[PDB]
Paper text:
Here we show how myeloperoxidase (MPO), a highly expressed neutrophil protein, disassembles nucleosomes, thereby facilitating NET formation, yet also binds stably to NETs extracellularly. We describe how the oligomeric status of MPO governs both outcomes. MPO dimers interact with nucleosomal DNA using one protomer and concurrently dock into the nucleosome acidic patch with the other protomer. On the other hand, MPO monomers stably interact with the nucleosome acidic patch without making concomitant DNA contacts, explaining how monomeric MPO binds to and licences NETs to confer hypohalous acid production in the extracellular space.
To further determine the role of disulfide-stabilized dimers for the ability of MPO to evict nucleosomes, we chemically reduced the single disulfide bridge between monomers in native MPO dimers, which efficiently dissociated the particles into stable MPO monomers that were still able to bind to nucleosomes. In cryo-EM, we observed nucleosomes bound by either one or two MPO monomers or by one MPO monomer and one MPO dimer through the same acidic patch interface as in the non-reduced MPO. This shows that MPO reduction did not change the structure of MPO monomers apart from the disulfide-stabilized light chain N terminus, which becomes disordered, and did not change its interaction with the nucleosome. As with non-reduced MPO, only the MPO dimer but not the MPO monomer induced disorder in its neighbouring DNA terminus, showing that this reduced MPO is a valid system to test the relevance of MPO dimers for nucleosome disassembly. Only at a 16-fold excess of reduced MPO did we observe faint bands corresponding to the cleavage product. This is a further indication that dimers are required for the ability of MPO to displace nucleosomal DNA and disassemble the nucleosome.
Numbering used by the authors:
A (entry chain A): 40 to 135
B (entry chain B): 23 to 101
C (entry chain D), I (entry chain H): 28 to 121
D (entry chain C): 11 to 118
E (entry chain L): 207 to 577
F (entry chain K): 5 to 104
G (entry chain E): 39 to 133
H (entry chain F): 23 to 102
Write the structure that this text describes.
DNA sequence: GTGCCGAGGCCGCTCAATTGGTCGTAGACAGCTCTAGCACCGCTTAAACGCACGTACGCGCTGTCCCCCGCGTTTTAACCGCCAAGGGGATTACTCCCTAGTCTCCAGGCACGTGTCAGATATATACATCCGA
DNA sequence: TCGGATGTATATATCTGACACGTGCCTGGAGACTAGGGAGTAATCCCCTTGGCGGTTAAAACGCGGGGGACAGCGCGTACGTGCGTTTAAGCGGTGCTAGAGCTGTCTACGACCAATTGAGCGGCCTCGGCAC
């Protein structure tokens, strides 16, 4: 058995070295179609459009999680909490 | 259709691990899903507006690229 | 002396239309002029980009409408769009 | 020759359609400018100006003053969510800040 | 060959008394006041014709359904159409863009913590339409020209007169007169016409009635507060002296008359204070009436679970099909009319400056209602 | 819950009677009466409201609302469509029954 | 008589959020601007409007930064703002 | 010329008070001075570049406004 | 089957100048082309704004130089300027 | 170790760069004005600068407990490979409104000058609030 | 837990300077007319997007155990807010000088605009090895 925090560090090292997408493609495409259904009906999506949306979303989420980690470390903690995400979004000017 | 749940807990865990996060609380998955939904809604609304102006029924990659660029999120590799 | 064009009289006319018994200072007038110039530049630039994307070389009311819908957030945009139409149609009637 | 009447009067506006058309033509925006674009732009500008001026006048009346100052414009802009979003990255001179205090700092 | 409203049987008919020779009792509808003038009867008949045509089309599209399902579906579509037309065309022209944006923001979802009941003050603050009544009724022929006999009819002779719609060419001339005649602009020195003030229900009643006086009397009977209390309720400043009242109303003579009548702004009736305030920019009501009406309609929209924009109520394709509806399209698709006004029918009042041949406007696509 | 009820009841789960028919109105402000309970102002002669005599409604409409008909100004942006749809919507919304 | 700590601070917070004047003396700021510009060009003249615009922009930027710093300090279950809060706010903002 | 000390401690305290800060540490002032110096250096460098391109010798308000717009801090009140 | 111009051959030529024995993939080519387009658009737009500010109708070498100085950060900008100057000088010589 | 799909090198055109005059306007000089930026001095005096107290707050030091991580098992749907339809992006041509370009006139909107009335500034007052007993 | 001290909003004069008009004029917007290239409709063409099926298996779910951060409580000691007295240049005026920003005038040379020419680069075609298994 491995003590907690070792497998997490191994995963951090592994996922920071690879470039592959971390979200399954079909569920993300389904979510994108569901969201776009509101603005217009009977819409067609190119594969490149869905790929670009996925890449942009993943990059945005990774940057947000980096800022959230900084916020959590500031409060003398290791565990990410929703208040850290809210503070990062408020400071960046998204929810302000 | 509840496809917002398609973004699973392991996927969010992988995204956080890529960002350097060591420990994750169990109450942040819903917040991440909401944030992703808001971002996708904004970008897709802009892309659909761009498509509608061009009198088309297909959302090309160029429309998404323009929508991302107009929000200060320029994306390289798709045109 | 060289004349300096500005959106001074028009803002005052709009203010008299809205608030018939209220004045406006010089600093507020300058702020209003800067705001009008900034919004004009933003909308015109968005319309130019839209015209260039579709390989067209003419700015029409459709480009302005799409630029307004893209820039102005929420209900504002909708109202603005209506006003735009409410003008152009009238300009066609005369 | 028929008596000359301005284009703004034809469209029932207060902003100058002709000046906007000249600015669009000389602004190096596109090779050609349609006849309906200046009317649309003038209508949009007039609507936005009327909205912000109405809010500022309401603030000034609530402050028992009969003249608009940049503080009133700042209050009108910041108190409206849509106008605040539109002018999120804009600094208004002599505007001050919206009065608020965090609930943590207040005494119990 | 087009349907009309069914007749009504009552113990006493103050509506047959207008014309003893015709012997034509007026109609029955969802409201007992549907025969005040031929215009209201024409509107109710048009709505009934639209419901019948929609039911026929739905039955033709889907024959498996029973009559009750057909009636319920037609009623639902008619209600959604009425809500769409109202909240998309009428209120923006009443409140004005600023008041509409302030009191009616974008719809989000149904809220169960808001009150959908009608406030008591709304039964008076909504009487502003009593200041938009033209003194005469206009009927026009197929060419929008004055149609004979009686191209213009005094309003004192058209009250409770159903015989003027069954035996006078139907409802098409009435609709043409409604769609191609400017309304009455409300001015500070011109509040309401004398036809409704001195010759109201002259034939039916022994003596005429005073509509503004009735409005004030009903406001007092309901025990509604004064002008100052409602001004303070909406956040507007409260006048106290003659000068403050003149500043608020932007008029001195009218303020002096009000002061000589009541003596204090707190005693001013709600209706007079609402209709005496200067109109908003591109609006038809003062700030207080706009506040009351916007609050009431926002409460009605938020608290309605069957709102057409609410999820589950309609499908996305159904919502897209419904979003293209318009009053001129319905007025063309349910009667013998052949020339209607442009979009925002409440604004177009000049022929033929803004009138279309109504052969190019889209129809209501019901192809999404297949089971 | 599939279709609306004619009487309008049960629309709200917390209070089914909320928004139904044949119900009392909503008072956004407390009602004012001369006796304070049920007497509308002007019923009893000699009463003073807010330290001032109660003005007669008929006179108020007589010398303020009245104006010469020949000076009627038509509206250049509205039509009878406005007033007709307003009356129809109001007839949809509310109705106060009164004793015969 | 002596007010307990934090009372005059709240009074000053309420007072300075109602005014619209400039909180930095004009002459020291003008001297600082001239000294900073001396490193780029020699014998440079400044319009009064330019110095006023620089002062307004600097004051607005500092006020926004202090608001963000106060938010950061409150997040850490503290009341006193510290340079770590300023650094964190600047890092998150992207500066 | 050490004019960075012209931004006195009471001035920084007042600026913090406008921002809603109740308690201020003693080391805040130096960091605030450094941040202000960096911001002023950037804006003034851009304004001087704009002036030099115009072959002028006076830094007008238009140059400062254009520099602020370039940095993304559009300022209303001066020029257009 | 239509012509689609791109900065493909020139990027390959520069790469062969820098790394004669190193290849480049298609995704990297697309990224490089997008980067070149973005930088070109940025510099051209800044130069146009500079020309408009000074009431000039011509984009010259001075406008491009000032735009490069304003946009590109740090010593990078300086180096870029040098290269451009040299090029212009050479183009004047022949 | 191993194949295979992707990066790399060759032909055929054809649609832009290039060479070669023309010209008319944008910009580069020289002159001259006069506005405003710089500098200098004297006086208040409001601001800043030290100094002492002590009180509240930042900061370590236990304690526990519950929640998140790590692991094993059954379960679910992503994913790859393949087929068949058909909606609808891309081209082409063919005009037809629609808009650029030019005189000519005027009115709309600049600058310059003025008088009066919102508004900032004392001053006493009546609240509104805080720390204490 | 009622009373004292202080801070502050408010009502009443008072002077002032800047804002809303008024007037002159000049140039940029409107009225016409003509000419040509942008694009709005139609008619194909094929391509690439959606839908469906089947087998594999890799990732998502779920339950269990434990140990390690999160949060609470408790000194403590120190440093920052609050007055209070003592320097100190900031702001306000008035004055004077000249630096350079702006305007006028002329001229000249340089980039847009024509046309004929031809070759640079893009598309399609093979072809072999760098690398993901
Ligand atoms: C056009 C001619 C109209 C006439 C002749 C008329 C007449 C009347 C009369 C006699 C009553 C009952 C007693 C009274 O209120 O005086 C009434 C009720 C009412 N009317 Fe009108 N009406 C007209 C139009 C309108 C319009 C256009 C509106 C609103 C847009 C309106 C709003 C109301 C309301 C809210 C009531 C309810 C009063 C109550 O229930 O006590 N009316 N009308
Ligand atoms: C004065 C009056 O009402 N006269 C009517 C008349 O207009 C109508 O034509 C006739 C038949 O209905 O009945 C009677
Ligand atoms: C419903 O309305 C209440 C009262 O205005 C409000 O507090 C609440 O947030 C609303 N709820 C939703 C879900 O909009």
């Amino acid at each position: 058995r491995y003590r907690p925090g070792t497998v997490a560090l191994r995963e951090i090292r592994r996922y920071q070295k690879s470039t592959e997408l971390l979200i399954r493609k079909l569920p993300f495409q389904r979510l994108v179609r569901e969201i776009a259904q509101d603005f217009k009906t009977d819409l067609r999506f190119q594969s490149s459009a869905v790929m670009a949306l996925q890449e942009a979303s993943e990059a945005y989420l990774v940057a947000l999680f980096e800022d959230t980690n900084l916020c959590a470390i500031h409060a003398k903690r290791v565990t990410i909490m929703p208040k850290d995400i809210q503070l990062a979004r408020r400071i960046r000017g998204e929810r302000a | 259709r509840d496809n917002i749940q398609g973004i699973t807990k392991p996927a969010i865990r992988r995204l956080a691990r890529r960002g350097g996060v060591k420990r994750i609380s169990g109450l942040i998955y819903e917040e991440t899903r909401g944030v992703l939904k808001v971002f996708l809604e904004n970008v897709i609304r802009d892309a659909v507006t761009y498509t509608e102006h061009a009198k088309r029924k297909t959302v090309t990659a160029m429309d998404v690229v323009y929508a991302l660029k107009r929000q200060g999120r320029t994306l390289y590799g798709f045109g | 002396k060289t004349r300096k064009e500005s959106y001074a009289i028009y803002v005052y006319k709009v203010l008299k239309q809205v608030h018939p018994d209220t004045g406006i200072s010089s600093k507020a007038m300058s702020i209003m002029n800067s705001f009008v110039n900034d919004v004009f530049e933003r909308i015109a630039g968005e319309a130019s980009r839209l015209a260039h994307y579709n390989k067209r070389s003419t700015i029409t009311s459709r480009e302005i409408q799409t630029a307004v819908r893209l820039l102005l957030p929420g209900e504002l945009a909708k109202h603005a769009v209506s006003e735009g139409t409410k003008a152009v149609t009238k300009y066609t009637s005369a | 020759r028929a008596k000359a009447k301005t284009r703004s009067s034809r469209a029932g506006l207060q902003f100058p359609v002709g000046r906007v058309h000249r600015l669009l033509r000389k602004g190096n925006y596109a090779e050609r400018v349609g006849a309906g674009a200046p009317v649309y732009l003038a209508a949009v500008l007039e609507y936005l100006t009327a909205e912000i001026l109405e809010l500022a006048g309401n603030a000034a009346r609530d402050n028992k003053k009969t003249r608009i100052i940049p503080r009133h414009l700042q209050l009108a802009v910041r108190n409206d969510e849509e106008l605040n979003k539109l002018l999120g990255r804009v600094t208004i001179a002599q505007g001050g800040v919206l009065p608020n205090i965090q609930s943590v700092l207040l005494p119990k | 060959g087009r349907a009309l409203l069914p007749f009504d049987n009552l113990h006493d008919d103050p509506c047959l008394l207008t014309n003893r020779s015709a012997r034509i009792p007026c109609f029955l509808a969802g409201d007992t006041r549907s025969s005040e003038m031929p215009e209201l009867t024409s509107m109710h008949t048009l709505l009934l014709r639209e419901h019948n045509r929609l039911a026929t089309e739905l039955k033709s599209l889907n024959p498996r359904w029973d009559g009750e399902r057909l009636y319920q579906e037609a009623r639902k579509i008619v209600g959604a159409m009425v809500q769409i037309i109202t909240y998309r065309d009428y209120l923006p022209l009443v409140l004005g863009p600023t008041a509409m944006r302030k009191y009616l923001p974008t719809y989000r979802s149904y809220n169960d913590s808001v009150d959908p009941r009608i406030a008591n003050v709304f039964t008076n603050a909504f009487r502003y339409g009593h200041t938009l009544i033209q003194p005469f009724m206009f009927r026009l022929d197929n060419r929008y020209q004055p149609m004979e006999p009686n191209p213009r009819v005094p309003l004192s002779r058209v009250f409770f007169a159903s015989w003027r719609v069954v035996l006078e060419g139907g409802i098409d001339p009435i609709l043409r007169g409604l769609m191609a005649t400017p309304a009455k602009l409300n001015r500070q020195n011109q509040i309401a016409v004398d036809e409704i003030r001195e010759r109201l229900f002259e034939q039916v009643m022994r003596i005429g009635l005073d509509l503004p006086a009735l409005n004030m009397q009903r406001s007092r009977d309901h025990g509604l507060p004064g002008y100052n209390a409602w001004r303070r309720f909406c956040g507007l400043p409260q006048p106290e002296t003659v000068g403050q009242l003149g500043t608020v109303l932007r008029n001195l003579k009218l303020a002096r008359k009000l002061m000589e009548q009541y003596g204090t702004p707190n005693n001013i009736d709600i209706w007079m204070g609402g209709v005496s305030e200067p109109l908003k920019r591109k609006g038809r009501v003062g700030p207080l009436l706009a506040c009351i009406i916007g609050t009431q309609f926002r409460k009605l929209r938020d608290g309605d679970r069957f709102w057409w924009e609410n999820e589950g109520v309609f499908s996305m394709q159904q919502r897209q099909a419904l979003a293209q509806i318009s009053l001129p399209r319905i007025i063309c698709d349910n009667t013998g009319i052949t020339t209607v006004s442009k979009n925002n029918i409440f604004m177009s009042n000049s022929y033929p400056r803004d009138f279309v041949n109504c052969s190019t406007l889209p129809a209501l696509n019901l192809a999404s209602w297949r089971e | 819950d599939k279709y609306r009820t004619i009487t309008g009841m049960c629309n709200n789960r917390r209070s089914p009677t909320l928004g139904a028919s044949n119900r009392a109105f909503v008072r956004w402000l407390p009602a004012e009466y001369e006796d304070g309970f049920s007497l509308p102002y002007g019923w009893t002669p000699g009463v003073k409201r807010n330290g001032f005599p109660v003005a007669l409604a008929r006179a108020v409409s007589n010398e303020i609302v009245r104006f010469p008909t020949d000076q009627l100004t038509p509206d250049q942006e509205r039509s009878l469509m406005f007033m007709q749809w307003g009356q129809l919507l109001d007839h949809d919304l509310d109705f106060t029954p009164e004793p015969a």
